[PDB]
């Protein structure tokens, strides 16, 4: 298949691993959002930015490189 990357943390979501999700306010480009953990979906529900969480790829590309 293909390796989707997570919406919150941009982890690697290899086939048969994550859990996809589609909200009522859906984007035309990303209708369905792929998540790798429940911890990724939990920080998506409380509406945290992907940056300011130190273990996501958004943080590690703006602070540490």
């Amino acid at each position: 298949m293909r390796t989707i990357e997570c919406e919150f943390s941009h982890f690697a979501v290899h086939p048969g691993h994550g859990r996809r999700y589609v909200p009522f306010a859906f984007l035309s480009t990303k209708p369905v959002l792929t998540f790798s953990r429940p911890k990724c979906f939990a920080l998506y529900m409380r509406k945290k930015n992907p940056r300011f969480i130190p273990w996501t790829r958004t943080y590690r590309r703006i602070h540490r490189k």
């Binding site: 298949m1 982890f11 290899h14 086939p15 048969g16 790798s36």
Partner: protein, 402 residues
């Protein structure tokens, strides 16, 4: 008075008695029907369960909604070191049954074969197969070998060979047994003179799993269920649990019978042993007969997925270790926990349905971790997410300091 509404009864009544298995190993109670027009070949092989994982493959099924589309199927990994043949038995038909004529032995038996005869091998005299070894090459014993080989050719209709799992090539730390698992494998194909010549030729020689099965076939898996102790009626039989305000308890069967017949029946569900039962579970499609890591350092690599990786996941199969030998990979689940010996036997079902004739090509084998959530497929991918960490930058500081 009749039962007011109808449900189908709980539990298949043909798997009674639901008592513990008499032996831990899978044992075939019936081999496939002997086609004497075929070529002589073995019919079963013992493998050990080594966790499970999932794959990705595209589907050739014309008419289906998933035709030429990729599915994710769960597969179970079963490690298969080769079995060494040590004997040849032969059985003759009687109106009572099927009587054993005799057994020849191999003239050379393994330490772990004749370990099966001892409850304590290391604190023993270890002199089993020691007078048979020296009588077999006397004048009278070379006669008696050929005496009972001829008695196979006269009386036997069923020729079987005796193999054992060869556990020292299974370099596994958690399968703690050191004596070998012994079973009989039936020869099917040809006449009895053509079976014995295949039984003589592979005697004191190891037989490998890809000489018994092919890559995209099915098989039966005789195996013993994972044990769960004494369980009550809701866990064991699947009865409905009673309403919350019930006195003395919920997880019970309310009525265990009428006034008359004034006895409890065998059909009424009761509590007792759940698990550790023998099951045969036909039509387990095989997807990959693997090859040892000494031959193949790249086992899970596909044509369509060129990542150089083995079948063993990151951090090993949980509770098992590493698959160090040949392996078969079957679609779905097999009855039993990891580390348990299981018997792959050739099918008795007609293998003519179009689901079972289907040739399998894979596209992906999940080699991610089974501890936690699997995220990386190789350790090369975790060293590219994570750069040099702290423990790496002080190991690189000791390596410059020397």
């Amino acid at each position: 008075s009749h039962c007011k509404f109808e449900h189908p009864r709980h539990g298949h009544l043909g798997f009674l008695p639901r008592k513990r298995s008499r032996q831990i190993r899978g044992r075939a109670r019936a081999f496939p029907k002997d086609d004497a027009t075929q070529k002589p070949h073995l019919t079963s092989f013992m493998v050990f369960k080594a966790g499970m994982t999932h794959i990705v493959r595209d589907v050739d099924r014309p008419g289906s909604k998933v035709n030429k589309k990729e599915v994710v199927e769960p597969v179970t990994i079963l490690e298969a070191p080769p079995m060494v043949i040590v004997g040849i038995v032969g059985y003759r038909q009687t109106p009572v049954g099927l009587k054993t004529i005799g057994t020849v032995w191999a003239h050379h038996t393994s330490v772990e074969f004749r370990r099966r005869y001892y409850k304590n091998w290391k604190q023993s005299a270890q002199l089993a197969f020691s007078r048979q070894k020296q009588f077999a090459n006397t004048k009278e014993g070379k006669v008696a070998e050929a005496r009972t080989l001829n008695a196979f050719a006269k009386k036997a209709s069923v020729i079987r060979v005796i193999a054992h799992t060869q556990l020292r090539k299974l370099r596994n730390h958690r399968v703690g047994v050191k004596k070998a698992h012994v079973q009989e494998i039936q020869i099917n194909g040809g006449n009895v003179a053509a079976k014995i010549a295949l039984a003589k030729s592979l005697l004191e020689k190891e037989v490998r799993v890809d000489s018994v099965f092919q890559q995209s076939e099915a098989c039966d898996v005789c195996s013993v269920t994972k044990g769960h102790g004494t369980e009550g009626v809701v866990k064991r039989w699947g009865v409905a649990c009673l309403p919350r305000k019930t006195h003395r308890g919920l997880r019970k069967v309310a009525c265990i019978g009428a006034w008359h017949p004034a006895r409890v029946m065998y059909t009424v569900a009761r509590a007792g042993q759940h698990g550790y039962h023998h099951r045969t579970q036909l039509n387990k499609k095989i997807y990959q007969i693997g090859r040892s890591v000494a031959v193949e350092p790249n086992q899970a690599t596909t044509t369509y997925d060129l990542t150089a990786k083995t079948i063993t996941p990151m951090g090993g199969f949980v509770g098992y270790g590493t698959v160090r030998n040949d392996y078969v990979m079957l679609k779905g689940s097999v009855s039993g926990p990891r580390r348990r010996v299981m018997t792959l036997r050739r099918p008795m079902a007609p293998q003519t349905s179009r689901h079972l004739k289907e040739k399998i090509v894979l596209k992906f084998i999940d080699t991610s971790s089974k501890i936690g959530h699997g995220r990386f497929q190789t350790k090369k991918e975790k060293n590219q997410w994570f750069g040099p960490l702290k423990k790496d930058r002080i190991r690189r500081e000791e390596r410059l300091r020397k």
